[PDB]
From a paper:
The transporter P-glycoprotein (P-gp; ABCB1; EC 3.6.3.44) is expressed in the intestines, liver, kidney and blood–brain barrier, and affects the bioavailability, pharmacokinetics and efficacy of drugs. P-gp belongs to a superfamily of ATP-binding cassette (ABC) transporters found throughout all kingdoms of life. The transporter consists of two pseudosymmetric halves encoded into a single polypeptide. Each half is formed by six transmembrane helices (TMs) and one cytosolic nucleotide-binding domain (NBD) along with interconnecting loops and short helices.
Here, we report higher resolution (3.4–3.8 Å) structures of P-gp bound to a series of rationally engineered selenium-labelled cyclopeptide compounds that were designed to probe the ligand-binding pocket of P-gp. We measured the effect of each ligand on the basal level of ATP hydrolysis of purified P-gp. Consistent with these substrate-like interactions, P-gp mediated mild resistance to QZ-Ala in cells. Here, four new P-gp co-crystal structures with a series of rationally designed ligands are presented. It is observed that the binding of certain ligands, including an ATP-hydrolysis stimulator, produces a large conformational change in the fourth transmembrane helix, which is positioned to potentially transmit a signal to the nucleotide-binding domains. Thus, we must conclude that the binding of subset A ligands induces these changes in TM4. This ligand binding-induced kinking of TM4 begins at Pro219 before returning to the apo wild-type topology at Tyr243 in the ball-and-socket region close to NBD2. Specifically, conformational changes in TM4 have been linked to this TMD–NBD coupling, consistent with our models.
Author numbering:
A (entry chain A): 30 to 626, 692 to 1278
B (entry chain B), C (entry chain C): 1 to 6
Write the structure that this text describes.
């Protein structure tokens, strides 16, 4: 929204910059005017051949006589025109170079200054300014916004003015050559302009707004893959796949509809373009027959005006470029223009000598920039004598730290004054104040350089001797000297991570090199190990004795030796004095003291449809064959009119052409819509097949794969959408266009080649060169782009280091250091940006000059050698068209290149994800399917390590046995060991060693589905999909539809019926947060219902009461208790009071069963279980 | 500019 | 598509 003035943005351009911009925009306007002048001569050429074209055919008597005057006229005229063209070429060359080079130079020269000034301004901000702002946003703002600004003031301006110049010049020549055709075309201008803009909007659809139509399936996919363990447990995979398939089924239909409409639109647009284009020309001919216009003039004005018309369209984007740049420059300059109160880059104020370090805080009221919300310091009074050391203590609020905060003048106080020696702190220079004050902070930071440098960040001028004495006086010498590389060792976030105390000591050394008169120590001893604490404490004590010191910490071991101790309450200073006095006071201090004591294989998948392709390619080849027919006509339109001879026959002939001229148009509506519709419908179907085959195979994989940190629901849904979205683009429109373009160039080149002898062979030498010359330029553009990104990446890295740790660097000053380093970092990209302008200009001008010089060789060879022969102009005009547009059609091959690459990378994954097979597949029909109902469960010598974390074993030699119709209670110290039983019985994993049986058969050889079909699993936080609760209950049994009275019975067994009959919708109510909300109790009871609607022989209750409270636990436990006792059961629940009735209790220890037996037996014994029960039991009594 | 001629 | 650019 907010923007910037035009003159302020360029404030950093002076002297040579303005000159570059002037000469640049000048040369640009010249370059702009250059083109329409080309089309102006083109009419004069037509008149030359037209004058001879009429006279040559008018004779029909003498032959040789026509070999004299005509050839001479063509000689002088063609030579003149060619000379001019050659003249234009050098011009466009020079002016192009000047333009792009100068503008790029200006841009670079400015942006450099912008960056430097901006970073300086960033560093110049006071801390209060940072406290209210996001640093990440600010740095990213730097790096991105400066780039936007760069894009804005760049060569884009030259292009804009050049476009405006083509616009004006085109319309000038257009009007001056004649007024009528221009206005007619100006009636055409809105018509066509309305068509082309819409066409472009239709093409751009590939970016993702696609969610609106698709997301319906994505929702199913997400809740499924989020619920994967539940759908796995209940084996409802076929259903989920079905749902997803249905949603896809809808999606494809919406897709083909969109395809139809879009194709119709594009076709209609093309028709409008055709019709108008032809109509204007027909009116032109209608004007030529009246002898009001020359045949060439028509061409001149037509092309000049249309040029002028589209110039606008291609001009517009540069406006937005300059537009965005102002808006970006706003927030940038805001910081540069911002002048703070504190500065610290300022040289001003007193720099006192012989500071004794007498400090006093007088009546200081303060609040951080949370402002009125909280006032932390209400009044204050404090003094500290020179050479003394004061210790600040407090219960909370950290008003203690506030003093150290203010003493550096990071903030100026609301009311009151802090006074160092006799003078107000605000009278003395900031930098000097900061330099006379040393600081040691709780969390020490070390910038990434050698230790020496970090010690050198104390003072820029220092010798290794001072470093040595400094670290040795901090007693950090030993620890670092033992380290390799000596002082040259590396430190930072990345690499050489050291002990906190060591880092603190290095910090103290850095502070010690500062040789400060004033020392501020804030909780530097705190948040550190007790052993190294004394080591660092020695240093801290040794860091004093030359200085006055204010210290703050939570450890009262260091306070006793302080000269004065100061307590705070609610921001109010209260207790002050020596230790004994404060202990005699028995106040806050005493209180705290006492308190602390080549893949075509996917193309083979599209081979499902043999048709729908041949149609589109045949049609698109016919379109490819239809395209140059447009050029053949235009040739003969101007051709017969030039070759006319007697005029009488012309009017009818020109009129029959303009008819036909349109006839290829209307037929172009049929063919274009076809090849777009066949390829489109073909695109939406395989998108169903792929996503269906991808998703399916994703439900095949076991839990082992879903536990992978590499694969998460979002990543899977993303991988699911993208690849399927991408492969469509490669097999889609692009291919059709390529075939259309090769067919286009092919038919074009056949016609051209068979008509012009060596006229075409010539062009085929020229055209592939300028095309390849066009591609290589884009390659150099990306190379310089990537290389530049890498260099500023290094300069942006030192900025991030500076502004993220900023609150430290301000304390140490040396911001100027980072200024200098940042500059030296920038210096390399700067010299690089100078070469950029030199290159960008040459590559541009070379490509323009080649196209203009090529245009000279065109008519020069077309005339002279060819026209001196019996070969004719009408063919020349045909060939140039045909060939050049064959080329401009080939350009789309280069333009469409990356799609296949991206699609290949995306098509690489999508096959792999299908071809991947699991260890345990739920799809296999193999496995025993025993006939015997009664379950038991045998765990024997089981060892299990989770595939994700094969470090700490959960299970080692676990062995369990539980008979039918009896409850197995499972207790454990902690961990998934209790759950892993339930996970392994469901067979999400096969254990590393050992084995598990049910009826005595090994489940490993058993059918997986049949196995999971007999299990009653109920988890902690049951996930219910969005659908009727009856459908969530009916989810308990698949491959069969559940009866109403059955889910009723199951609902009755689960005691949820109170809710279900209470709801307005009853069993048809929707749950899962889309249509309704329920608490954990209802959800759980539903889980119970779906558990026992399955009628399992084995119930598995995994911490069912985990998240729950009050009566809910009671009723749910009642339900669960009612659910069991008729079945085999394994209950791991954390309430042991509810396990007191269990057939077998088993205490798990380190993966081995430790204690096992009935409650009273484990109670008779005194051991782990007794403790487990004793700790939680009577805790209710402790709660009383 | 789309493909026919504009 | 004749000579200017269409």
């Amino acid at each position: 929204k907010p923007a910037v003035s035009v003159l302020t943005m360029f404030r950093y351009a002076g002297w040579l910059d303005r000159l570059y911009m002037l000469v640049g925009t000048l040369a640009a306007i010249i370059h702009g005017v250059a083109l329409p002048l080309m089309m102006l001569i083109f009419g004069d050429m037509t008149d030359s051949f037209a004058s001879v074209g009429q006279v040559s055919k008018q004779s029909t008597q003498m032959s040789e006589a026509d070999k004299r005057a005509m050839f001479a006229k063509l000689e002088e005229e063609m030579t003149t025109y060619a000379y001019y063209y050659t003249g234009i070429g050098a011009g466009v060359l020079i002016v192009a170079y000047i333009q792009v080079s100068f503008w790029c130079l200006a841009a670079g020269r400015q942006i450099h200054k912008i960056r430097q000034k901006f970073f300086h301004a960033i560093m110049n901000q006071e801390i209060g300014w940072f406290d209210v702002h996001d640093v990440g946003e600010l740095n990213t703002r730097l790096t991105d916004d400066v780039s936007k600004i760069n894009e804005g003031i760049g060569d884009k301006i030259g292009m804009f003015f050049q476009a405006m110049a083509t616009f004006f010049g085109g319309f000038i020549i257009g009007f001056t050559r004649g007024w009528k055709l221009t206005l007619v075309i100006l009636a055409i201008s809105p018509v066509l302009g309305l068509s082309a803009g819409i066409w472009a909007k239709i093409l751009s659809s590939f970016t993702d707004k696609e969610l609106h139509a698709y997301a319906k399936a994505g929702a199913v996919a997400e809740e499924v893959l989020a619920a994967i363990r539940t759908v796995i447990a209940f084996g409802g995979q076929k259903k989920e796949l079905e749902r997803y398939n249905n949603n896809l089924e809808e999606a494809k239909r919406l897709g083909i509809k969109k395809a139809i409409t879009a194709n119709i639109s594009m076709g209609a647009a093309f028709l409008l373009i055709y019709a108008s284009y032809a109509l204007a020309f027909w009116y032109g001919t209608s004007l030529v027959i009246s002898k009001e216009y020359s045949i060439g003039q028509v061409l001149t004005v037509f092309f000049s005006v249309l040029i002028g018309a589209f110039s606008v369209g291609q001009a517009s984007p540069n406006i937005e470029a300059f537009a965005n740049a102002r808006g970006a420059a706003y927030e940038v300059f805001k910081i540069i223009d911002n002048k703070p109160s504190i500065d610290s880059f300022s040289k001003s104020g007193h720099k006192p000598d012989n500071i004794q370090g007498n400090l006093e805080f007088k009546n200081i009221h303060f609040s951080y920039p949370s402002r009125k919300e909280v006032q932390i310091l209400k009044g204050l009074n404090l003094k500290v004598k020179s050479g003394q050391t004061v210790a600040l203590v407090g219960n909370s609020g950290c008003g203690k730290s506030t003093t150290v905060q203010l003493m550096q003048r990071l903030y100026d106080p609301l009311d009151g004054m802090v006074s160092i020696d006799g003078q107000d702190i605000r009278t003395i220079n900031v930098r000097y104040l900061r330099e006379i004050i040393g600081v040691v902070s709780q969390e020490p930071v070390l910038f990434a350089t050698t230790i020496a440098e970090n010690i050198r960040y104390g003072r820029e001028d220092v010798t290794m001797d001072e470093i040595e004495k400094a670290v040795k006086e901090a007693n950090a010498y030993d620890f670092i000297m033992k380290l390799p590389h000596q002082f040259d060792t590396l430190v930072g976030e990345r690499g050489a991570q050291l002990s906190g105390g060591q880092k603190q000591r290095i910090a103290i050394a850095r502070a010690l090199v500062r040789n400060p008169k004033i020392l501020l120590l804030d909780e530097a001893t705190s948040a550190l190990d007790t052993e190294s604490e004394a080591v660092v404490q020695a240093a801290l004590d040794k860091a004093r004795e030359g200085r006055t010191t204010i210290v703050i910490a939570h450890r009262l071991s260091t306070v006793r030796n302080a000269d004065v101790i100061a307590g705070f309450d609610g921001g109010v200073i209260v207790e002050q004095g020596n230790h004994d006095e404060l202990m005699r006071e028995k106040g806050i201090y005493f209180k705290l003291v006492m308190t602390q004591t080549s893949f075509w294989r996917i193309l083979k998948l599209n081979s499902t449809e043999w048709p729908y392709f041949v149609v589109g390619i045949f049609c698109a080849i016919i379109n490819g064959g239809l395209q140059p027919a447009f050029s053949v006509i235009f040739s003969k339109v101007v051709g017969v009119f030039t070759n006319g001879g007697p005029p009488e026959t012309q009017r009818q002939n020109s009129n029959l052409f303009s008819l036909l001229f349109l006839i290829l148009g209307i037929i172009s509506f049929i063919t274009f819509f076809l090849q777009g519709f066949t390829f489109g419908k073909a695109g939406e179907i395989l998108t169903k097949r792929l996503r269906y085959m991808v998703f399916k195979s994703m439900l095949r994989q076991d839990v082992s794969w879903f536990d992978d940190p590499k694969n998460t629901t979002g990543a899977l849904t993303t991988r699911l959408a993208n690849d399927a979205a991408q492969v469509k683009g490669a097999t889609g429109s692009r291919l059709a266009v390529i075939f259309q373009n090769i067919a286009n160039l092919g038919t074009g080149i056949i016609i051209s080649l068979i008509y012009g002898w060596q006229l075409t062979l010539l062009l085929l030498a020229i055209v592939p060169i300028i095309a390849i010359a066009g591609v290589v330029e884009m390659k150099m553009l990306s190379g310089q782009a990537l290389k530049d990104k890498k260099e500023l990446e290094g300069s942006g890295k030192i900025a991030t280091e500076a502004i993220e740790n900023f609150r430290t660097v301000v304390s140490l000053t040396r911001e100027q250091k980072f200024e200098t380093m940042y500059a030296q970092s920038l210096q390399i990209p700067y010299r690089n940006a100078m070469k950029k302008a030199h290159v960008f200009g040459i590559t541009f001008s070379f490509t323009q000059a080649m196209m203009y010089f090529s245009y000279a060789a065109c008519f020069r060879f077309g005339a002279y050698l060819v026209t001196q022969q019996l070969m004719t102009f009408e063919n020349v005009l045909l060939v140039f068209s045909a060939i050049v547009f064959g080329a401009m059609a080939v350009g789309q091959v280069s333009s469409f290149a990356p799609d296949y690459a991206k699609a290949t990378v995306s098509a690489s994954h999508i096959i792999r994800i299908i071809e991947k097979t699991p260890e345990i597949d739920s799809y296999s029909t193999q496995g025993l399917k025993p006939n015997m109902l009664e379950g038991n469960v045998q765990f024997s010598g089981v060892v299990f390590n989770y595939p994700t974390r094969p470090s700490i074993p959960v299970l080692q030699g676990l062995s369990l046995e539980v008979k039918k119709g009896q409850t197995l209670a499972l207790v454990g110290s902690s961990g998934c060991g209790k759950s892993t039983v339930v996970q392994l019985l469901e067979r999400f994993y096969d254990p590393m060693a050992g084995s598990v049986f049910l009826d005595g058969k090994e489940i490993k050889q058993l059918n997986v589905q049949w196995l999971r079909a007999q299990l009653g699993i109920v988890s902690q936080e049951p996930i219910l999909f969005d659908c009727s609760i009856a459908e969530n209950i009916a989810y308990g049994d698949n491959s069969r539809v559940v009866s109403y009275e059955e889910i009723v019975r199951a609902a009755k067994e689960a005691n949820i019926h109170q809710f279900i009959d209470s709801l307005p919708d009853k069993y048809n109510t929707r749950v899962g947060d889309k249509g309704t909300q329920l608490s954990g109790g209802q959800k759980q009871r539903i889980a119970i219902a779906r558990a026992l609607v399955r009628q399992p022989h084995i119930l598995l209750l995994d911490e069912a009461t985990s998240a729950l409270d009050t009566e809910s636990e009671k009723v749910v436990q009642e339900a669960l208790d009612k659910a069991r006792e008729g079945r085999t059961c394994i209950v791991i629940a954390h309430r042991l009071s509810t396990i007191q009735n269990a057939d077998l209790i088993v205490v798990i220890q380190n993966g081995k069963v430790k204690e096992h037996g009935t409650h009273q037996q484990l109670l008779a014994q005194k051991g782990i279980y007794f403790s487990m029960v004793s700790v939680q039991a009577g805790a209710k009594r402790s709660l009383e | 500019x789309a493909x026919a001629x504009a």
